[PDB]
Structure formats: structure tokens, C-alpha cells
Amino acid sequence: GSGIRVHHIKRRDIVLKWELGEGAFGKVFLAECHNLLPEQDKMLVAVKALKEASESARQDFQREAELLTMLQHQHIVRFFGVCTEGRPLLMVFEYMRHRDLNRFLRSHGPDAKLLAGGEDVAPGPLGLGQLLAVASQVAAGMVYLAGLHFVHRDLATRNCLVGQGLVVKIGDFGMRDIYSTDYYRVGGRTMLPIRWMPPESILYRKFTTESDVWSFGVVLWEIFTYGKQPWYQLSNTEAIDCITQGRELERPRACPPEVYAIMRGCWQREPQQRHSIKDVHARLQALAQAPPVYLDV
Ligand SMILES: C[C@H]1CNC(=O)c2cnn3ccc(nc23)N[C@H](C)c2cc(F)ccc2O1
């Protein structure tokens, strides 16, 4: 009965060009969409496609579509609508031409085996002001979602998308991507991105906006390491021991100590002793506006 209206889209207005990537829920394609919005008569979009189509997944899908349509903000990937008219089930978002933030970060890092193209940003390392631009944008999306008492349980650079002009949006809310080394399998269809998770979550399986503040800290770290795995030398086992024993990630080489300061604040053992997401953003927007000077050794 009652609910949020989700723009339905006619399958005929959706022409899949080619696969962009794959997940556990299903695949993502580049696609052309006709008469989606009056402004542009034909345009490029990302299209999520569901693998399996029972009434258990159609229930998920609907909630997901309802929730996606409610959460609309400057730093959250534009959702356009679904298409239910014949399997496969479809969700349509704006096309973000720099893909997920984790590969974008990796493509602009020193260890890059190729030099990254594009007309909107220089190959090789980014500017600090750029790094804080990225950091500030992700915080701004977290500030919104906290505002609505929404809890992201997999905040990580692999779930942010990067667009033309170095726009950074939150891209996926989990509710997806198959199985990397970031997730520890603790049971059938129960995997946790435990490296991003704070003590409260590992120890008491509690997750709050404060837990997200902790994991956003690990995202700053991802950003300032050009998308390295937290605790990459360690095992999921050894990581859990670190997190639970108060061992913290070392400041990155390319991280000013004023930024590391903000990280260290995200990583308080006591959730209530962690800075609010609003406060974290503030200090990031500020530093983005006036990047300090920093060198090496
Ligand atoms: C398959 C990958 C790659 N997606 C795109 O290149 C890609 C480019 N634009 N865009 C829009 C949504 C979208 N992907 C893309 N949604 C998917 C589920 C998504 C979201 C993320 F935060 C991260 C990755 C991701 O999907």
C-alpha cells in the first residue's frame, strides 16, 4: 500500500552497451537511457542488474529502491529509478566516469604500473587539496546519512564512486560486491569488512553512527595511502587482534599530521569519546580550503 514512489523506467529506453563490473547481487553495465529527463534526450547511465529474482530478492529490491529514492544528496550517487517489467530486475544511476574511488586512488598512486589518463586530472599523485576534497566529500555524505539515523555497515573507498571534475559520491550502501580480502567469512552469507570495523562491532556486534565515524577514519587512511588495504601484511585474525587491543594504523607517508590527528580521533575505543561526523567534516572542509605544507623526511 503506502510508500515512496520510485520512478519506473521502460526497458525500451535502456540499451546496455557493455559490462562495467560484477557482484554477488548481480552485474553492473554501462547503458544509454532515452527521454530519462527532458534536459538530455539520450544519455549514459550505470545499471545494476539482479542475478536471482525470487520474491525474497524482489522484497529486498523494493526496500532498496524505496530507501535509495529517499536518500538524495550532493554526495550520494544519483538514483534515477528501477525497471521491474521483465527479469532481470534493474536499478539505474548516473554514470560516474572515474569508477569506484578505490581503483581511482590506486591509479594515481606511486606503485601504479601504468600512468592514468583523463582530461579532468593530472596523471600520478594527486594534490593534498585534492585528497582533502575527496575526504571532505565522503564525510559530507556521511553527515547526511547520520542526519537520517542511517547506518552504513561497509563504508570503504570501494563503495564510493568518482565522477568528472573529481566529484566523490557514496555509491553502494552494501545491503553486494562478491568477496575480496577486505571481508572475513564468519558464516554462510555473513561476511564482515572487519578491517573497517571498530571494537564495539567485533566485540558486542553493535553498529551506530559512531561506528561509521570509526570506519570513515579507515577511509581517510585508504585515501592517504592511494587505496592500500588496512593491515595488508596481517590476516583477518591478526587485524581483529589489532583493532581489539587498541593497535592503530601508522600515519601514511603522504598524510599531514593535522589529518592523522583527525584519523586518531575517529579511532577512540569509547564511541562517545569519538568526534562527531559533523566535526570531522568541518576540519576537512577547512583544511581543503587552505591545504597546509608537507614534505617527506
Ligand atoms: C561494478 C562497480 C563499478 N561501477 C561503475 O564503474 C560505475 C560507474 N558509475 N556508476 C554508478 C553506479 C554504480 N557503478 C557505477 N553502482 C555500483 C553498484 C557501484 C557502486 C560503488 F560504490 C562502487 C562500485 C560499483 O560498481
Side-chain angles (χ1 to χ4, degrees), residues 20-22 28 46 48 77 93-96 99-100 158-161 171-172 176:
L20 278 174
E22 214 151 321
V28 180
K48 187 163 160 45
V77 58
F93 312 79
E94 56 176 330
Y95 172 60
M96 311 281 287
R99 277 35 174 203
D100 77 82
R158 67 189 171 264
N159 301 322
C160 310
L161 295 167
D172 183 78
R176 194 261 315 167

